[PDB]
Symmetry: C3
Subunit: 189 residues, 3 copies
């Protein structure tokens, strides 16, 4: 059960769903278009021998912000982390999906959102996994529409929503593209 | 709320959901398998210095149609745009997802559908974002099953469905893999 | 309509949804975290000239199992098939999605799940399509959390669920990352 434009608007006007800033001209038949922030993480480390999800490696990426008025250039075959300009606050009874946009995929710009869902209870900017699969670099402009948020009704309110100690959540409140915290509570056999 | 095979069939027999041509043998437990068209766009431009989503660049891709009876060869590490053989027409109260198929991913053929959803009100062929992540070229045969359409019920009918001036839709009615129109209404900060 | 943690737990305690082994500490606001098996398929064939989805090519991949206590190393720009440690059994009235996890995408580990949905009626381990889009190899540990299962309610029970002869299903009961069976019932124009 995916929220139509009208119901998305109702969740926003009722204050159940926070989107800051909210621009109503971005609402779409079945989603709301979202915008790109000015914060990027590039994989440009030159000391580590490998990535180990069980280990903390905060230096794996560098935080990069382009000069005001300039794009970040995503190179062919490159993957970076970006972030939404908007801060989202979800209630305990909706879950979102942060998808890409067809216009952007037609240019070879892919938003992966590998994890699929934004969890009930989540509040923060959303970290975007961005790939360029074209043969040419792509100028990414801070502020451009980069994807769309779709909301699904939960069957019932989540018992221990994102942010709760019991969920063990890692990214509640994030203001940028937080480096991975997979090493926390990491398990292996 | 995802439509079962029976309910998909009901939406089709009632005329609420158009799929042209419709082959009932393609309906699946929870989706309908879809087929590949004979139209492909390759990234083979040799004049542009880069991609700028704010700019119109219709020559970024070339339209390629294989000789009747022959496959299009998707090379390792290559991304192209393809298209569904079927033309889909959605009502204002369903949204679809055009996913890949597990058999094809097991060979390294990935349908990205980065944008996720086919919008309430959308009518046209669906443009497929296709990658080969194997070590070998893959022969793509026009007419083969290439993915599957899953339908979700909307919470309520969409107020301004895809195709409406208010939605500002770019691809209503597309018969092939339309080049990107991201430059239209493009915004940036 | 996506199942909350509580409703996921109800489907499990009622015996409608099988997850073997089930670890309740893995349930999340809107999904259940899943774990990686010790079975991997690498694309390391050196005889075939190309991939043809219409043809049987069982030797396209090699099955690889790391030494107990050691990781499988996924190299930059590499795609392999992995598998869930858990065996899932779905009823005829739910469909699942096997997504990645944000912690893992922040390291450049992408679970594609190109096909999106686990079908009503499906029973088996789930085959994971894994890419490394970082600049560094990633040690994948058997037993680590690798993704999350989200469940959606179907509109109604599926008439011919996965596994039925009428659905023509290829992978019912799979215990590992089964090589592709796209050649079965393969169609082309
Ligand atoms: C997901 C997807 C959608 N589509 C179609 C169906 C969607 O309803 C339509 C628009 O998808 P959108 O993701 O909304 O594309 P867009 O926002 O960049 O462009 P627009 O202004 O037109 O909204 O494109 C494809 O052709 N291929 C795809 O992979
Ligand atoms: C999405 C996905 C599904 N599966 C399982 C669960 C699905 O119900 C089952 C079939 O997925 P499908 O995408 O329907 O695969 P298929 O159409 O190519 O093959 P089939 O004829 O059997 O339908 O495979 C995986 O193992 N890995 C995955 O990533
Ligand atoms: C899908 C996605 C989620 N998120 C946010 C919203 C999710 O509710 C939150 C967690 O996503 P998860 O996929 O649940 O991440 P995780 O399991 O690795 O970490 P955690 O222990 O915190 O659950 O991250 C992004 O920032 N970017 C994304 O692409
Ligand atoms: Mg749109
Ligand atoms: Mg199938
Ligand atoms: Mg999580």
């Amino acid at each position: 059960m995916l929220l139509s434009d009208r119901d998305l608007r109702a969740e926003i006007s009722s204050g159940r769903l926070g989107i800051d800033p909210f621009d109503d001209t971005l609402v779409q038949p079945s989603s709301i278009d979202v915008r790109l922030d000015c914060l990027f993480r590039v994989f440009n480390n030159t000391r580590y021998t490998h990535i180990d999800p069980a280990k903390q490696q905060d230096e794996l990426t560098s935080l990069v912000q382009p000069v005001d008025g300039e794009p970040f250039v995503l190179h062919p075959g490159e993957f970076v982390l970006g972030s939404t300009l908007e801060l989202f606050t979800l209630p305990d009874n909706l879950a979102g999906r942060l998808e890409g946009k067809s216009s952007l995929g037609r240019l070879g710009l892919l938003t992966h959102s590998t994890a699929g869902f934004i969890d009930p209870g989540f509040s923060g900017h959303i970290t975007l996994e961005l790939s360029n699969v074209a043969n040419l670099p792509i100028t990414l402009w801070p502020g451009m529409k980069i994807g769309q948020l779709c909301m699904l009704r939960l069957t019932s309110p989540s018992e221990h929503p994102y942010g709760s100690s019991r969920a063990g959540s890692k990214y509640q409140g994030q203001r940028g593209p937080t480096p991975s915290r997979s090493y926390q509570n990491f398990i292996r056999s």
